[PDB]
Structures are given as structure tokens and as C-alpha cells.
Design a protein around this ligand. Sequence first.
Ligand SMILES: *[C@@H]1O[C@H](CO)[C@@H](O[C@@H]2O[C@H](CO)[C@@H](O)[C@H](O)[C@H]2NC(C)=O)[C@H](O)[C@H]1NC(C)=O
Ligand SMILES: *[C@@H]1O[C@H](CO)[C@@H](O[C@@H]2O[C@H](CO)[C@@H](O)[C@H](O)[C@H]2NC(C)=O)[C@H](O)[C@H]1NC(C)=O
Ligand SMILES: *[C@@H]1O[C@H](CO)[C@@H](O[C@@H]2O[C@H](CO)[C@@H](O)[C@H](O)[C@H]2NC(C)=O)[C@H](O)[C@H]1NC(C)=O
Ligand SMILES: *[C@@H]1O[C@H](CO)[C@@H](O[C@@H]2O[C@H](CO)[C@@H](O)[C@H](O)[C@H]2NC(C)=O)[C@H](O)[C@H]1NC(C)=O
Ligand SMILES: *[C@@H]1O[C@H](CO)[C@@H](O[C@@H]2O[C@H](CO)[C@@H](O)[C@H](O)[C@H]2NC(C)=O)[C@H](O)[C@H]1NC(C)=O
Ligand SMILES: *[C@@H]1O[C@H](CO)[C@@H](O[C@@H]2O[C@H](CO)[C@@H](O)[C@H](O)[C@H]2NC(C)=O)[C@H](O)[C@H]1NC(C)=O
Ligand SMILES: *[C@@H]1O[C@H](CO)[C@@H](O[C@@H]2O[C@H](CO)[C@@H](O)[C@H](O)[C@H]2NC(C)=O)[C@H](O)[C@H]1NC(C)=O
Ligand SMILES: *[C@@H]1O[C@H](CO)[C@@H](O)[C@H](O)[C@H]1NC(C)=O
Lengths: 197, 133, 35, 270, 50
Amino acid sequence: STASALGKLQNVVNQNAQALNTLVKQLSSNFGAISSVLNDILSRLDPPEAEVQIDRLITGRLQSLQTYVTQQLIRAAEIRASANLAATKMSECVLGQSKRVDFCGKGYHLMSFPQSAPHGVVFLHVTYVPAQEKNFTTAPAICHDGKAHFPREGVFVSNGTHWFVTQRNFYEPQIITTDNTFVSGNCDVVIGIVNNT
Amino acid sequence: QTRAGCLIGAEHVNNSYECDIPIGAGICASYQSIIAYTMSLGAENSVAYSNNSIAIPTNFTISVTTEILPVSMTKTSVDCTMYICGDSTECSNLLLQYGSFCTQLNRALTGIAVEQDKNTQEVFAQVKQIYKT
Amino acid sequence: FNGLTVLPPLLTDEMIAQYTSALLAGTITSGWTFG
Amino acid sequence: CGDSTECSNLLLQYGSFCTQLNRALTGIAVEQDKNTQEVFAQVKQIYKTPPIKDFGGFNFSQILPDPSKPSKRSFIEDLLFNKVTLKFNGLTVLPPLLTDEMIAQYTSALLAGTITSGWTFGAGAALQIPFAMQMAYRFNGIGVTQNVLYENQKLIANQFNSAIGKIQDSLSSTASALGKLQNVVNQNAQALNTLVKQLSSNFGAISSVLNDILSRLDPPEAEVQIDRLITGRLQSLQTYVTQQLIRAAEIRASANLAATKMSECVLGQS
Amino acid sequence: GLTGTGVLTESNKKFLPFQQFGRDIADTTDAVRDPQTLEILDITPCSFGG
Ligand SMILES: *[C@@H]1O[C@H](CO)[C@@H](O[C@@H]2O[C@H](CO)[C@@H](O)[C@H](O)[C@H]2NC(C)=O)[C@H](O)[C@H]1NC(C)=O
Ligand SMILES: *[C@@H]1O[C@H](CO)[C@@H](O[C@@H]2O[C@H](CO)[C@@H](O)[C@H](O)[C@H]2NC(C)=O)[C@H](O)[C@H]1NC(C)=O
Ligand SMILES: *[C@@H]1O[C@H](CO)[C@@H](O[C@@H]2O[C@H](CO)[C@@H](O)[C@H](O)[C@H]2NC(C)=O)[C@H](O)[C@H]1NC(C)=O
Ligand SMILES: *[C@@H]1O[C@H](CO)[C@@H](O[C@@H]2O[C@H](CO)[C@@H](O)[C@H](O)[C@H]2NC(C)=O)[C@H](O)[C@H]1NC(C)=O
Ligand SMILES: *[C@@H]1O[C@H](CO)[C@@H](O[C@@H]2O[C@H](CO)[C@@H](O)[C@H](O)[C@H]2NC(C)=O)[C@H](O)[C@H]1NC(C)=O
Ligand SMILES: *[C@@H]1O[C@H](CO)[C@@H](O[C@@H]2O[C@H](CO)[C@@H](O)[C@H](O)[C@H]2NC(C)=O)[C@H](O)[C@H]1NC(C)=O
Ligand SMILES: *[C@@H]1O[C@H](CO)[C@@H](O[C@@H]2O[C@H](CO)[C@@H](O)[C@H](O)[C@H]2NC(C)=O)[C@H](O)[C@H]1NC(C)=O
Ligand SMILES: *[C@@H]1O[C@H](CO)[C@@H](O)[C@H](O)[C@H]1NC(C)=O
């Protein structure tokens, strides 16, 4: 339904067409000579000054052609940079799972699929986005029997009355056991430790 | 009167919306009549920080987004002695005394074309076998 | 025209479609192992 | 031409070079705006730091915005802005789209988000988290167990505060630490200055001013003299434009790198 | 004998008693001294823009 989502490829095509059009239209300029067509100059006067007129035409057309070529070189360099980036993206986000944040997609990357387009490529990135947050009270460690317990993976939370351990990215409370925690030191130096069992 | 100059034909409002048509110096205009205003950088919220409170998600969503990248452009070729002389012996003889300004251009264009082919090949040819579902 | 020519690309669009199909089938069936 | 009818009439037969030059410069300007916006606009909302600040003993007073100053900039930002320091002849300078206040607002939003919510806000909705626990996660991410952080909290906070103070003093006292930005400013100014200076050249004509040539000769050779000046000035202007294009490409590469660094190192751990 | 277009204003520059006119940089005249009143004026180019 929505159009104008492919602005970049369209811009590339338009720039190339515009450059070609201006180059071909430059052929209709006098550059100070008596005419813009070489056959009439040849057919209207003797050599000794035909050389003068042709020199004017030649220098003008050379300048135009050189300008065109230089612009083309600059544009090609830019396109090559973009293509290198695309190759890296397809190597990293399609043949594997990427950890560098926001490189491909917004969220936590899962996978990607490529599709072809007339002068480029389109990636579809699949990402995981959390939602429906909730708020809890938390502590850094638990003091029990004069020892300090920390969680292996997860974090301590409480709903107001009891304490649990959860993984960081999904609410899933569990009873605090000696298997999901480890011990180090005594509850004296940790700021914010709480009493529990 | 704006820091970017002077503007006639549009009305200045005190609101602030998303930018449609950039004008400059932090202001832009849009169609409603035509109105000019100051850009809004986004919404405004204050996350509720505290030293013993945490927020944990309870659900998730799966999202799909696009990314578009150009990889190549058209390969073009131009001939000097036809472009600037158009099959004239006298023009060719006069151009001859400029050295080589036409070997160079052809070399440049050919290099560009070969580069385009290499670009496409390295982007897409990433596998050794053609797998089938 | 006056000496301006356009050259065709080496890889036709059918071949590019075939590459994309191969990549997508590989990632659906085997995961990241085929990389 | 500089307001000479004869010069304009002679120039009329040179084609459509002006469209090309203005088109190139317009492309450059639009690209500049896109560069800035792409680097800095990494967030959707404008977060705000809470009025009460107890970040486990860590102290951010040097980098948080100061409402006292009209600039609404932090201490370090003022030092940076005071460190580097800098419509005449048919050439003009256009203002940027984003003012400095907006850049400061973006920077403040990023800082508040990362201090208050960790790396969550870069992948959805910001989630509150006490700062010490965030630092514990960050240690756990480099192979050191979180046990270590909580038992050495005060020492770590002191080291961080001292390092911030040291970087403040080093930046304030020592100069020539910002060579790149000063270099960019100097290059732009020098290019413009030499382009203006080129007006006084002769290019083989009898004089460098159109009025004298017009008022001291009949048209038949006055045309030749103006033609020589025209071609010389046109060539100089072309040279300027090409140099600008090269420099712009280089700056675009640098800006892309900056955006990648901001995304991968401020919104997450690398 | 010094010709040019622009807008003329009053200026507070102090010409040392033998100069006639001043330029800033890149050889662009900025101030003049009128041969009769012997006071320093200021020249500003007439406004333009796209
Ligand atoms: C968890 O509880 C806190 C505090 O009860 C909630 O904080 C709210 O924050 C907004 C924005 O600062 C205020 O407008 C509300 O008044 C606060 N609620 C209060 C004070 O009860 C917070 O929204 C809750 N939810 C989450 C996910 O943190
Ligand atoms: C916090 O969670 C705990 C466990 O999910 C809740 O305790 C349970 O509450 C239900 C509701 O009546 C009882 O049927 C269970 O027997 C309780 N479990 C135990 C072990 O006693 C507790 O009510 C929650 N607190 C709040 C404020 O919602
Ligand atoms: C977290 O913040 C709270 C409130 O800002 C701190 O509670 C303060 O503790 C001190 C020392 O016990 C008391 O003198 C204050 O009266 C308390 N504040 C209030 C509002 O009651 C707490 O110390 C902080 N640190 C934690 C909980 O580890
Ligand atoms: C956690 O429990 C311990 C012991 O069960 C508490 O330590 C006692 O604290 C009181 C008041 O500070 C002292 O009078 C006792 O002598 C302490 N007993 C021991 C064995 O140390 C500790 O205060 C509790 N923590 C909290 C936050 O209430
Ligand atoms: C998580 O979110 C999903 C969708 O956002 C919830 O699934 C919806 O549940 C309602 C009521 O049960 C249905 O009417 C919708 O049709 C469901 N959506 C889909 C796509 O099936 C889901 O219930 C949420 N999880 C929890 C625990 O509430
Ligand atoms: C955070 O560090 C700043 C350093 O800039 C502290 O501010 C200084 O505090 C000392 C002692 O009060 C004063 O002598 C300085 O004049 C202050 N400097 C400035 C620029 O105001 C600040 O106190 C520290 N934060 C806390 C909570 O102590
Ligand atoms: C040129 O002659 C006029 C005429 O006298 C001078 O103007 C006089 O200047 C004096 C000096 O301030 C005044 O007191 C008179 O009132 C002026 N009179 C008139 C009619 O202008 C002028 O100073 C002379 N300029 C020179 C000598 O450079
Ligand atoms: C609103 O806009 C009007 C005119 O655009 C202006 O005079 C006024 O100061 C603005 N602010 C308020 C609060 O009315």
C-alpha cells in the first residue's frame, strides 16, 4: 500500500539519469564559436579559421567530459562503501546471531532474511521486544546464618511479603534455595543486605 | 522574522510538533493553511528512580523490520572521438595534439564497471552450494 | 545517441534470485551451521 | 561577473555550469544535516534525572546539566566550547538545522537514560534499576563475579570520582587536545579565504577589474580580456567545489563511525 | 578616485593623521575618510541572498 519506502535506490537512479542528461545537453553550446554544429562550420568556411572555431568547441567539450568523469568517480566510491557495509551485514546478521547492539534491528536480534531488489538488497530483521512491565522491591544479597548469599543468575525480588529469584528478562519467581545461590563472606560489608531464610 | 531570514505567507504558532519541512535555526513549517513552528525533540517523561526498586517485564512481542541498501549502479561507457568530434577527420587531427586525455577516461570508466560487478559478486555469492527446501 | 552506451551486468537477476533462495533455504533448514 | 551586463552576456554561452555547482553544494549541505541527526537522535523520549541523587556513592556533578547557566550545559561542555575558537562577495553561509540547545538536550537525555535504566532503554522501554546493581551486572559481563563489586564499593567509587576530576583538570589546563575539530575549522576557513583571494589575479589579461577594461578599450578586444578573466575565475571555482566534495566524503565516513560508537558503546556494553 | 557600492555609516575607527582609507583582509576596503569633513566613515555591502 504505502509507496516511497525505497527512496535510496530511486535517488541513485535519478542522480545517474540527471548526470547523463546534462552531459548530453551540453553538446548544444557555442563556447564562443560561431555555431554549435561542426558540419556547418566545416561547410561554411576555409580551414585556417575552421581550426580556431574547432579549437573552441574542443576545449569546451573536453572540460564538460572531465567534470562528468570526476563526479562518477566520487559517486562510485560512495557506492562501494555502502556495498561493503551490506556484505558485512549479510555475513553477520544472516549467517549467525549478532550481539553488537542495534547493528541489525531495534531490540534483541533473533535472525534475518534477505531479499533482492533491482539495485540492492533488503533485510528483514526479527527481534524480541519485552513489554508489560511491573515494579518490585529488590536487594543485592541475603543475610542468613551470618553468611551472605548472592544469586547465580537472576536477581532477588519481593512482592511485599516473600522473596524470590528471577531471570532478568522475564518474570518467573522461584523459591530461594541453596542451589541457585552462592555464598561468600559475612553480612557486614554489603550495603543494603536484608534478612531472610 | 527568523534567525534564518524572513518568511512571508505562513503563520507562527506557539505549539511544537514533529518536523515536516525543515527551514533552519531550529524551526520548520507544515501544512494544516501553512504554519511555522519550533521542532519538538520528542515526548517527556521522568523514569522513577529509587535505590531499592526494580522493573521486570512480564510479556513480549516479536517484531519484523526492513533495511534497504544499494549495492550497484549502472555501467556506462563513453567514446571520446565520437562525443567531441562526431566522425570528422579534421576534428580528430586537431584533437590528436592534446596527448592522451582519452585513454585516461576510458580506463577510469572501465575500472568503475568492473568494480560494480565485483560489488554484486561479493555481496551475494556467499555460499558454495545451492540448497533446496 | 552520440557514443554513450550501457553495458549489461554479468549476473542476471534470475541468478541473484537463486542465490537469495539458496541462502534462505539454508538458514531455515540448518540454522547457522552451514555458515 | 559582479554586476556587469557584458560579462553576463558573454557568460550566457557557457552552458549550465551553475546548476551543477549549486546542485553539488546543496547535496553537501543536506548530507551535513543528515549526519548530525543520525549521530545524535538515538532516542525517542526525553528522560529526566530525579531531583534526589544517591547513586551508590558515585558522583556525576561534572557531567550533568547545570540549570544555573543559560546554556543548560554541563561543566565539561562549557570547557570544550570555550577551548576551540574560530555574506561578503556572493558567497553565503547557512545555519544548521539543530541548535546547540537541542544537541545539549539530546546529550542530557542519553545520560539520564543510561544512569537510571542501564542498557534497557535502548531496546524498548526504560526499566528502573539501582545503580550499584547495574555496576554489578557490568562486572559480571567481563568475567569477574559480582561478589567482588559489593565488597569494594567505596574504593571503586573513590577511584571513579578521582578519575573524573583528573580528566577535568587535564582538559582545562592542557591545550592542543582537540586538534581534529580545530583542524576542520581551519581547513574550511582557509579554503574560503583563498577562493576570495583569487579575485585579484590577472590570468594574463591587462587588469583584474572589469571597469578598467571596459572604460579603456573598445568592445572588440574588451571581449577577449573579459573572456580570459571569465575562464580563470570559472576554473578556480570548479577547483573549490571539487575539494569540498572530497572533504565532505571524509567527514561522512567519520560521522558514520561516531554513530556506530554511540550505538554500540553508550547504549550497551561492548 | 576610490569607487564602490554599499551603504555608508558613521564609524569610530581612528585613522592616524596621514591615512586615507582602510582595508581589513583579502584587500577589501572597509573605511574611508571624506576629503572635506575629515571624518571616518564605514562601508557595508548592500544586502543580498537567495
Ligand atoms: C512502580 O511504583 C512506582 C511508585 O509507586 C511507580 O512510579 C510512578 O511514577 C510516575 C512517573 O514518575 C508517577 O506519575 C506515579 O505517580 C508513580 N506512582 C506512584 C508514586 O505510586 C511506577 O510507575 C510503578 N510501576 C513501574 C513499572 O515502575
Ligand atoms: C506474594 O506472593 C506470595 C506467593 O505467590 C503470596 O503468598 C500466597 O498467597 C496466596 C493468596 O491467598 C495463598 O493462597 C498462598 O498460600 C500464599 N503462599 C504462601 C507460601 O503463604 C502473597 O500473598 C503475595 N503477596 C501479595 C501482597 O500479593
Ligand atoms: C536508600 O534510600 C533510602 C531513602 O533515601 C535510605 O534510607 C535512609 O537511611 C538513613 C540511614 O538509615 C536514614 O537516616 C534516613 O532517614 C533514611 N531515609 C528515609 C527517607 O527514611 C537508605 O539508606 C538508602 N540505602 C539503602 C536502602 O541501602
Ligand atoms: C538481621 O538479624 C540479625 C540477627 O537475627 C540482626 O542482628 C541484631 O541486631 C540487633 C539490632 O541492631 C542487635 O541488638 C542484635 O545484637 C543483633 N544480633 C546479632 C546476632 O547480630 C540484624 O539487625 C537483622 N537485620 C535487620 C535489617 O533487621
Ligand atoms: C501477552 O500478550 C499476548 C498478546 O499481546 C496476550 O495474548 C492475547 O490474549 C488475549 C486474552 O487472552 C486474546 O484476546 C488475544 O487474542 C491474545 N493475543 C494473541 C496474539 O493470541 C497474552 O495473554 C499476554 N500474556 C499474558 C500472560 O497476559
Ligand atoms: C561531587 O563532586 C563535586 C565536585 O565538582 C562536589 O562539589 C564540590 O564540593 C566541595 C565540597 O563541598 C566544594 O568545595 C566545591 O566547591 C564543590 N564544587 C563545585 C563545582 O560545586 C560535590 O560536593 C560532589 N558531590 C557530593 C554529593 O559530595
Ligand atoms: C572646506 O571649506 C569649508 C568652508 O569653510 C569648511 O567648512 C567649515 O569648517 C569649519 C571647521 O569646523 C567650520 O567652523 C565652518 O562652519 C565650516 N563652514 C562651512 C561653510 O562648511 C571645511 O572645513 C573645509 N574643508 C577642508 C579645509 O578640508
Ligand atoms: C502565542 O502566540 C502569540 C502570537 O503568535 C504571541 O503573541 C504570544 O506571546 C504567544 N504566547 C502566548 C502565551 O500567548
